[PDB]
């Protein structure tokens, strides 16, 4: 299933991220990661056309928090399986 | 329940914000986040007019700390139930 | 075996290489890294020529992801059974 | 009870500072927190002139030692108890 | 017994002088060490001979990585048996 | 008892303060306490003459080795019990 990713800078630009995601279509918020030096991504899924509502809702949100930095975005269609067990994607 | 959250860099700044909030209205001080490079969120739960009391008193305070640095805050009214399972804010 | 990996800073652009280097060959997806900084490593495993292809595939992917940034990339053909039980590459 | 609370950039400063502190004032060492970026905290419990005293040298030492930095320092009076379950300050 | 380690700045890299420092000489990768801001060593142990012949191919093959950086490189001949139980380079 | 430390940039520059400082003088290696940004600290303990002699020699070979960078260094000659269980140096 399609999955879609925003990663800011910051913490409380990524929870506003992930609600204004799951406010804005069809997903479901599953992912949570942080790889240091203050980057932080929140991860749904869905279909491809709910995950590019939410990732577009989420970005403008993200963007107007207080201090807020969204550092990048992304979506894929279809990932492969082999990424699921490997990357905390679901 | 509605959320607030106070972001510094610095752990003392964030002690004084978390305080600082706990005592400005009737929120309860539920989580307290580290994702790297000295930046540390501190989260509050309640009435959204009581996190807005809070979140303006603990930012306030924070400010004043002794190289204190708020870096984000923001606060969310209603988030939704699916956040709570995955972001630590409860 | 052969193995292959991308560097990134991000995550978001770490997982698109990891799904375009699967896509792109038959390899498997078999380590996911984390050093900070924002860095972070995917790994595959394969013949060769299929690493090489794959790599090729991950590497313009993850650029063009945005706010993508690939920090390295490498590939060794047969490395020493000495570095799979210290490194996780398998 | 009082919370005071010295964060310096390096170990061996902190180190300094919590010898210092516990040797000032009747006050005791309660706490090390480590939030990255070379960001370390020592926190101590006690009477708040008590603390102040502690603070107040804990500060001119670890300012003393060979490559060291304060950062940040605080004190707080009467934290609520709701920050002593939540943050590692007992 | 004699110790080899090299710094780089990057998994890929790292990984590269792992496989280049065994293929080398007579010695064995031992370990791997991260201790944040990108900075990662790996570590090999046998003769002082061997162990120089190791990581003069390490560094020259880590170096040639794409992206790769090397921050750091040293050998110790004969290290006390005090740092085997505290360090991981065993 | 005595306590002394070195903290370096770089993993390689601290194992050789270690080796270093336990080959200088009676003391023994106890400690190695990472706190991110590439800074960490070996520690030892002894007599304070002896740990003076130790953290001399430890210095000016952590300063030697390529790529290597000390921090800061300290010593205390007889620390408070209440570090000790606080604080990883023993």
């Given at each position: 299933?399609?999955?879609?990713?925003?990663?800011?800078?910051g913490?409380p630009a990524?929870?506003?991220?992930?609600?204004?995601?799951?406010?804005?279509a069809?997903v479901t918020?599953?992912?949570?990661?942080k790889?240091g030096?203050?980057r932080?991504?929140?991860?749904?899924r869905?279909?491809?056309?709910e995950?590019?509502?939410?990732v577009?809702?989420?970005?403008?949100?993200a963007?107007?928090v207080?201090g807020?930095?969204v550092?990048?975005?992304?979506?894929?269609?279809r990932?492969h399986?082999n990424?699921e067990?490997?990357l905390?994607?679901?």
């Open positions: 299933i399609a999955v879609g990713m925003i990663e800011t800078r913490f990524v929870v506003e991220a992930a609600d204004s995601m799951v406010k804005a069809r918020l599953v992912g949570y990661e790889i030096s203050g932080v991504t929140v991860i749904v869905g279909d491809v056309s995950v590019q509502a939410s577009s809702a989420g970005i403008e949100a963007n107007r207080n807020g930095e550092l990048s975005t992304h979506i894929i269609a990932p399986e990424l067990y490997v905390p994607i679901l």
